[PDB]
Design a binder for these strands. Structure first.
Ligand SMILES: [Zn+2]
Ligand SMILES: [Zn+2]
Lengths: 89, 62, 237
RNA sequence: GCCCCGGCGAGGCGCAGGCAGCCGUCGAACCGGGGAUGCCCGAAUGGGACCUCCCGCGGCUUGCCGCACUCCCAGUCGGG
RNA sequence: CUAGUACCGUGAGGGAAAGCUGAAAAGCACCCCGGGAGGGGGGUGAAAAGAGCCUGAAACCAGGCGGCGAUAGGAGGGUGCG
RNA sequence: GGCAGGGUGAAGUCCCUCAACAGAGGGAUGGAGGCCCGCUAGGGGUGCUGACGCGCAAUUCGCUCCCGUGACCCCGGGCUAG
RNA sequence: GGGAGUAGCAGCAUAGCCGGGUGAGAAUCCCGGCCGCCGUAGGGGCCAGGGUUCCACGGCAAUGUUCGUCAGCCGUGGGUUAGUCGGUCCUAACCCGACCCGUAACUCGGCGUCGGGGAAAGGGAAACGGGUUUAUAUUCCCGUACCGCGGUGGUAGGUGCGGCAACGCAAGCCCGAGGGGUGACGCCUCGGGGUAGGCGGACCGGUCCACAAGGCCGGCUAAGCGUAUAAGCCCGGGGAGUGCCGUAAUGGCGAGAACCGGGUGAAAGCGCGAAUGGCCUCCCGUAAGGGGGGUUCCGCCGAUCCCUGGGGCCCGUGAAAAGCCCCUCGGGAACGAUCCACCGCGACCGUACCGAGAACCGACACUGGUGCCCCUGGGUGAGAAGCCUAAGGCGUGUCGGGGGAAACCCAGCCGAGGGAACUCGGCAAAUUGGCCCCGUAACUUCGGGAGAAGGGGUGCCUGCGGGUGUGUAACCCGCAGGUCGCAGUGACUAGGGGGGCCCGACUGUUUAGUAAAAACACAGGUCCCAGCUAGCCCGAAAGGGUUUGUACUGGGGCCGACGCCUGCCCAGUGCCGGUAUGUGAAGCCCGGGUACAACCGGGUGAAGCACCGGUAAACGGCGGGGGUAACUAUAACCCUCUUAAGGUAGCGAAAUUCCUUGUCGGUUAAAUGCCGACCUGCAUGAAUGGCGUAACGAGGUCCCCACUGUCCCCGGCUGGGGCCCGGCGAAACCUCUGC
């Protein structure tokens, strides 16, 4: 093992080969899930991945269609209601 | 103690490497200047009247 | 001879310098040349621990969008609105000029001269009390007991600083003191001068005793001010 | 080690006593005078140097010239 | 003399040793032994002066010759007689 | 970047029986500590006043002994100069 | 030259033998077999550092602690192939330049800002398996993939939908501006799901055994593409308390529980990739090569590897930026992709080998150090312990041969009867030892002391039972009986214990290389300066440290956990403050003197000195001769003799006591020792702290139980040296000599 792989940011895994070798493969770690701006609660409908993984997805497979996809639904409804009630006069 | 065993700790990075201007191994790599000619610190050459090395290089009397 | 610790500190080396890259930024109010007569409104959006401060700090977002840090008062809530200016109410957390603050009020973060950003009464649990108002000066009682006059246009914030009672509990262990000192790169552990050699300290020598009065004149030169510097008295009472 | 003009007048191919060969009488080697080519670093200067190696802008047609700092004359071009 | 060179030190810096065949390479053709380095016979040259090369001292070592040499007492010498 | 394995059992959270002016007694959970045993790895150096002492070594070896989740051990990049 | 053909070529890993071969020549080189060593490292992988040590052929003058046909040695020729691996990007702590300021000046010192640098283990686009070479391979070849840029051609869209909702969807292009997220994070502890690896049974194909059964070997499947649940979060319906739901544990609910349904969401698994590909095996003349076969099922343990959720601690809060995804705005065009298929392009450097008891540093082929930096099968077993052992590696921790192996030494084993009589001293050695049950003193800061002490038991075989579990799967817990031995933690592993005294509270640190401690530090106590253009400090200055700070703060001293306490003295030295009455230098003023000065005499004149006061958890200090009671004694007390004041509480022959082995008592047959008391304290005493003190100590010291070759008193064994033999081959020392 090289020093770059003695580093615990590489998540080693053991894998048996079609030739009977049983080698070690190295991969980088996955980033965590998107969180709400107001409450810090987790979001739904948003996939996890590194940039190369996210660039192999279309636009509509990355976020929910509804407005304000960066907020949890309760906070979204708060925002829409406040807009409405300020659009009265 | 202070002798033979601490001499084993000599596989770190070197204090001095080869110098681009004068060809000697006197370029301090953490500080960024040469201990012989002054490259990296001086546009002019380091030259002292108490030193013999430049006179030896030019086969001069002291 | 050899040098003292107090003389080596002046050189400015890593052994003595504060690690302020670790901290949250400095704490200052808002400049007058941008809060002249406007009475700005802001909302508190976070309360944070600061490693270089002894008091908790709060993050305030203002209307334009500007975010800033303030020293937090005992009682302030996340989601609360504060006001900075001359026509701000008298309520815990608001910043006003001393000329608009009644007598008997508890006050913190007082400026020395108007516009200087805040200098006085900053530590956890401290408070100052407004004593007298006049047209040329406002007299305030500082936590040292001392009465001091300020210009009436100097700004202060109303309430008490948060984080009091800190010293109610013993440190207990040497290791906890290790970590507390490392957090601000204080010289720790501390040596005694009477168990140093004579080359190292004006005390010092193999018989471990001060052999001359420990009271030292205000006019003594550096390298010689150790013990009780210009003491008016000594002892128990 | 490449070219030219003069001299010298037959051998020459560095210190350096070899095997194979080549240059020279269409004037060499050698001597005097004058030209051409002249990698990288270095004041080192288009921009950067933990390894005398790397990375760019333009504009003319790969092939080409120019692009540092401080200052003088100027002046929105340039000459020092 | 392939010297501020080889070499030593993290570095400022420190710093050696080492000249001569012969007029001419004419630098030992040929035979026996030896695994070989080499030895021995033969040759070149006025002379081996043979590259481990002008002369070639002393200390030291081996063999040959001469004198002494296992009943014996003084810093290693002096005088006299064999 | 790292530290085999085992022990003890702090706060916090409770259950049952008999009673309730007060209380009495029996069962668990939980996993703290500059806590304990430990030649895990690592770090250190108490005694034999042992071996060695022109050494394996210009400070080493062996037996025995100490720490071992912490004021702990180590690595790459930097800073302080008579 | 002598020393000397001598010492050394032992000790921490004692390894060779037989047969065959090469070659002039073989203990030392090659093949086979037997016998051995390492086996959580002496094996595997790989940084820095080294630099060709790598490979093949040929050699043996020198090197190699012996030899040598061998080699990290000598000679001759060869060898390092990348869009995907690393460097070229980003910032960290930090560094530099310009401008600016300082310096007699500078190659010197600074500096906010502007810019530029700074990580081959931090952040950070994209490739896996098999073969091929003497020597390179995620780099060449085969197969199958991915990324970025740029094109071509179609489509979704612009100008479209399904769901109450959570959400599900190909769901428009170019340029710019904001916002959100991710990047992006500490220590400790626990559950759930997976994997690598291991184990057990069946079947096939092989192999080892008088037989015999039985034992042992092989029984495989990458990236990539496609495919969905778990926790957690969420959406709808529903409508609760003398309560109900849940966890290993904490918990949850009208601020909306139970219960019905659903949505989004990891690591994995599955399919394709993929086969005479890889492995095992069976027949033929064996050069090309030839030929045919097998590649299957259940079950158990499982991590220190991967994913996912909970809980706890902080006077301590555990990086940043580039890059990447999404949303909304503003400005443009009429077109046109984040979808499908195809086509082209993808520069520079590194890439061999060692990686250490012989390729690095230590002058060496050095028992040291760098690196134990990352990783490791089966059995016993708590165990990465020790012991045996597979794989892999080695027989080179590079001199051998003889010997019933003389004395003597190094490292080990046993020792009758006594049991510390040895010695400064029980130094060294011995004793004890694992697990289960019983039982456990003083003292205590009530936490401990404590594994106190002390006592019983333990093997094999045959049978019964329990817990969890679907289980004659797997792990763990009890009982009874029979039986053998001197001995059942039978080897390995594996505490000797108790009682007094002194110091230091404890964990921690220290004189690299004669001192590990009673010395340092520590929590805590108390004193001093300071309201910030401060106080303390660096510097020639400019500027700067404490300071991204502001009295619950920053700096400066002394004592040193905890408990009971901390007496008197401000005359002296020191520090602080106050009044000026004195004195007080230059300068100013007055007068004389000088055709002008130098000069002479007076006054004023700050800080400081003097004078008045405050201050001892400031430096420091804390007094004899005299007399007396119901008879011998000693004197509460009384005369007393001087200073600033005249040693309080306590302790006391002390780590402090000169006479000293003080005296009395205890411990011994016997005490210059130890403990307890007494007090003429040469020369104790209260934060240079005083007196005590549970727990702790490789600290110093006295005693008791046990144990022993320490001793009486020395004896016998085992390996390695010493001695003889063959080989390599020094040094310190040396006037000449030597009853
Ligand atoms: Zn939200
Ligand atoms: Zn140089």
């Amino acid at each position: 093992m090289k020093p770059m792989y003695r580093s615990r940011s590489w998540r080693r895994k053991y894998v048996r080969t079609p030739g009977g070798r049983t080698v070690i493969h190295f991969e980088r770690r996955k980033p965590k899930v998107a969180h709400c701006a107001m409450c810090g609660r987790p979001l739904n409908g948003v996939p996890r991945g590194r940039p190369s993984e996210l660039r192999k997805l279309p636009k509509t497979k990355k976020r929910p269609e509804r407005p304000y996809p960066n907020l949890c639904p309760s906070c979204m409804r708060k925002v829409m209601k406040a807009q409405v009630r300020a659009s009265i006069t | 103690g202070a002798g033979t065993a601490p001499k084993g700790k000599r596989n770190r990075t070197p204090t001095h490497i080869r110098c681009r201007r004068c060809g000697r191994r006197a370029f301090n790599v953490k500080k960024g200047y040469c201990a012989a000619c002054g490259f990296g610190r001086s546009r002019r050459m380091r030259k002292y009247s108490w030193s013999h090395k430049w006179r030896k290089k030019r086969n001069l009397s002291y | 001879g050899k040098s003292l610790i107090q003389q080596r500190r002046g050189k400015g080396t890593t052994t003595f310098r504060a690690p302020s890259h670790r901290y949250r930024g400095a704490v200052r109010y808002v400049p007058l040349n941008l809060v002249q007569e406007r009475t700005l409104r802001g909302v508190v959006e976070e309360i944070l621990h600061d490693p270089g401060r002894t008091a908790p700090v709060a993050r305030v977002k203002f209307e334009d969008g500007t975010k800033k840090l303030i020293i937090a008062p005992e009682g302030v809530l996340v989601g609360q609105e504060i006001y900075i200016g001359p026509e701000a109410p008298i309520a815990i957390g608001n910043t006003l000029p001393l000329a608009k603050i009644p007598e008997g009020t508890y006050v913190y973060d007082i400026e020395g001269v108007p516009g200087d950003g805040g200098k006085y009464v900053r530590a956890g649990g401290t408070y100052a009390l407004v004593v007298s108002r006049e047209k040329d000066k406002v007299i305030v009682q500082l936590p040292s007991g001392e009465l001091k006059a300020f210009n009436p246009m100097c700004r202060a914030t109303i309430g008490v600083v948060a984080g009091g009672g800190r010293l109610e509990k013993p440190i207990v262990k040497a290791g906890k003191a290790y970590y507390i000192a490392k957090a601000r790169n204080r010289f720790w552990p501390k040596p005694r001068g009477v168990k140093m050699n004579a080359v190292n300290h004006p005390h010092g020598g193999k018989e471990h005793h001060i052999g001359r009065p420990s009271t030292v004149s205000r006019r003594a030169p550096p390298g010689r001010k150790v013990g009780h510097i210009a003491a008016r008295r000594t002892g128990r009472r």
